[PDB]
Amino acid sequence: EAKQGEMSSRSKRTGIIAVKCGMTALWDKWGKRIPISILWVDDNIVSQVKTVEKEGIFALQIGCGQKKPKHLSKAVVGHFRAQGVPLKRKLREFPVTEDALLPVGTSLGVRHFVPGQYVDVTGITRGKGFQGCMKRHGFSGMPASHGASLSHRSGGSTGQRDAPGKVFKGRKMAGRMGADQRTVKNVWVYKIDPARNLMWVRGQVPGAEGNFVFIKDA
Amino acid sequence: RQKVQAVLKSIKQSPKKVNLVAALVRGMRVEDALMQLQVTVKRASQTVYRVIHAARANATHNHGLDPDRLLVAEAFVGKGLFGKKVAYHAKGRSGIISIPRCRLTVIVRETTAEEEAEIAR
């Protein structure tokens, strides 16, 4: 994947921040079915161009969504106003090269992404709460017809006077699993719309039933 | 005089329960004391309140005190008699539980010259 979008030979173009709308099922011309995800880009715009000259690093501050003065907390109302930039639901920074540097106040959209090529998403995933092992890590469990008060628990660290009561950094039942996990080197974008600025992807994009995803690798 | 004193003896609710709430009004205004007390839920607040208000009334009925220039300077608890009893367990093993009681003391003084800091607050 090269010679597309808008840049020179080699750089990283900025990322674009969208919302997981759901999944559906398309078909191809060769009569085969692929699952589909629709990522909705809410008129994302540039709100701060970060600078090695002044600040120290090369970053485009893309805002997404829409918000209202009754919903922002004044310390950011001031930010948006000083930038003179329409209000957005969530901010997000990207580090991109010296080229691929945008003017304050240029909106982005899905035609930034050439179809047929790949992306990398980052979606703060769907935690499940204070789960335990055997689901958190796919541990096994002792039988259900012989052993008591263990039917679903775990084992015990290596342990004896040597490795003296020193459980190394092991694997225990633990709190939730909501985090940001990329799906590296995604599979090509089916289609993106001129209006409505959606985009369909072959499937399995992390993030909630809405409100969370980022995209890069292009 | 000064440091008007009001104690309450035989409070039949354990000391680590009473002082837990007393620490809330350990050192501040009597008005807001009487107010935080009736919006706390813990059921030691009612006796702590009885005691602070009784201190204020004694401080009034004894001369030389302005029950609005009052603020609790010091106040604490103290264990009292607790009539022990046997305690039962499995396997015939016995134990003892002690139904506890305690006392509370409050000691108030005028707000001598600290309104100047308070308004600054």
Added chain:
Amino acid sequence: KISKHKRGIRNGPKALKPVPVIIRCRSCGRVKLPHFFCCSG
């Protein structure tokens, strides 16, 4: 076995925080946290 040091350290951070904003029925007597049905008028 474990002494005042640890006992105080453990019971401390479970300290009582004075309650924030607290309103009274201007004339109807009672005091209350917000969002209550003290009174009517």
Added chain:
Amino acid sequence: FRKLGRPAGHRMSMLRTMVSQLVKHERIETTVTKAKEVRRLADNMIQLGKEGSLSAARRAAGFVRGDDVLHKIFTELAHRYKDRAGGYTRLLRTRIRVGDAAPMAYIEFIDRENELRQSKPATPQPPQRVPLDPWERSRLT
């Protein structure tokens, strides 16, 4: 959504008694996170007073009980909300006191003699319109 911590038979057979008493009397004082639950059966039993047919009456015969609060509904609550489209209870939060830190709540109907929060007037709904998705509100400042 609430379970209240009760076997799903006993839970119903309580909620029925609660809505029925809420209709016999006019106000009740109950634990809030359960008032937040009768908040639904009361209205879905007002709707049957509004419909009043034989079908939607013999159905209410199952959900309300105790006394002829059945007839109380059908006769007065209809005629006092023949217009009010939705929202037939107020569910105020009195937190009076209990000995269990359990909140408490007044729950009672709306257009009576002495309500608690003197209501707004029962206005008929406006009729539906087609939803659109312009997403054109910049909200800049």
Added chain:
Amino acid sequence: LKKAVAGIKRINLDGLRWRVFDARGQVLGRLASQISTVLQAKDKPTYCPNRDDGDICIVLNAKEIGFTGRKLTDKFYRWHTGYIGHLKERSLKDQMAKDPTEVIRKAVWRMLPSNNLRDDRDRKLRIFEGGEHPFGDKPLEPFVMPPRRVREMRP
């Protein structure tokens, strides 16, 4: 970055002395022990061992530095990351192509006396692997190593 390299001289006492150790590119340990003294204030008379009066000593041009023998590719630095198994190891060639400051900083750190004023002494030490330093406008005393270098020579 003038800021991020000017350090925390806003924290020490300043009012004693600024001194400059510029290794001419000769030898680690014989730079080092001299430092561990000067940067411990044991070299002036008014020493008292319950305090920090370490003078500011500033080393210069750690790129031009010489370590004899062939330890360069033999003596690594070893460090243990807690996680079972691991032992992250790095030779001195790696270390010197990375940052030839860390080398001597760590070395004198180990030489300094093993007490909790050690960190509170290194708080009085700064490094540039150039000759370029922003600590010039302050009273600058360049320093000379002892006159004790006979330097035995071999065939």
Added chain:
RNA sequence: CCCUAUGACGGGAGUGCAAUAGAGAACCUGAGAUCCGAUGCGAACAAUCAGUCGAAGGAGUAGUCAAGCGCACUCACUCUA
């Protein structure tokens, strides 16, 4: 007898050689462990029979005395680290 409490063993008034919260009812003397306090200093980047010896500190601050009303002594002293 009054004062706040549901109710006073409470607080005053009062008897009493006793201030009777150092006789207020199991009640003289009232100690150590134990608990909650009030003050002064230390205390959230520094590791352990918790100290001993040194010690910058901080604070509370006394006295004698010709010499002059201060300063300059009492290594002042006491806590602290």
Added chain:
RNA sequence: CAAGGGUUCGGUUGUUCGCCGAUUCAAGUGGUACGUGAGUUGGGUUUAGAACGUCGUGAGACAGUUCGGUUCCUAUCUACC
């Protein structure tokens, strides 16, 4: 030279071992209190019963054999999620 990643299932035996049948890229050798019961199991084996062979002149034993034979702990600390 190299430890980065791997190192299977099932049949009889309590089996570790081992033999086997079917497979794989391979079916590694030791350490880790012959890792791991305040994690589990409890079959062997070392309690009481009972019996077979053998020994003891009996009481009984058997490093021979078979059947059955209560598995305690509410986590202070260090460690760790």
Added chain:
RNA sequence: UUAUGCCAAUAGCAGCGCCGGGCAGCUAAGUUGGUAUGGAAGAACUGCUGCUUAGCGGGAAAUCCUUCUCUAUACAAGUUCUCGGAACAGGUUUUAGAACAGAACUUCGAUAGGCGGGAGGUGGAAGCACCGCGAGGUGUGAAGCCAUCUCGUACUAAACGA
């Protein structure tokens, strides 16, 4: 089986009473997606110079960087913007959740409920008409209902005069 006298239509109970179904949610038996490139140093092993001291180059799923994650209590404690009645706090929820936390909404408002419209599940409501003595069937009728999902509407509860 007990009750609402009975018919009618419902309810309780049989640890959903038992069946046949069952959306959203969850899961995997399902579906995705990865098992890479580039860069440096460099293992035996290999070569060539040398000038007998040395010089460099290939050189392994190995080591270290690039991807992914975590991180400024990173104590040399980093940088940028903005707020200053600003941040909190409380209340309705939550795609988030043991409390805490995060995120949404807090009346120039869609935060949850409620009501209307669909979608989505069950699968021909009752009453009425017919056919037959009946069990029962057919029409009125994709009827009837509704755990969820969307969509309209502030009708309820989320302002605030501490």
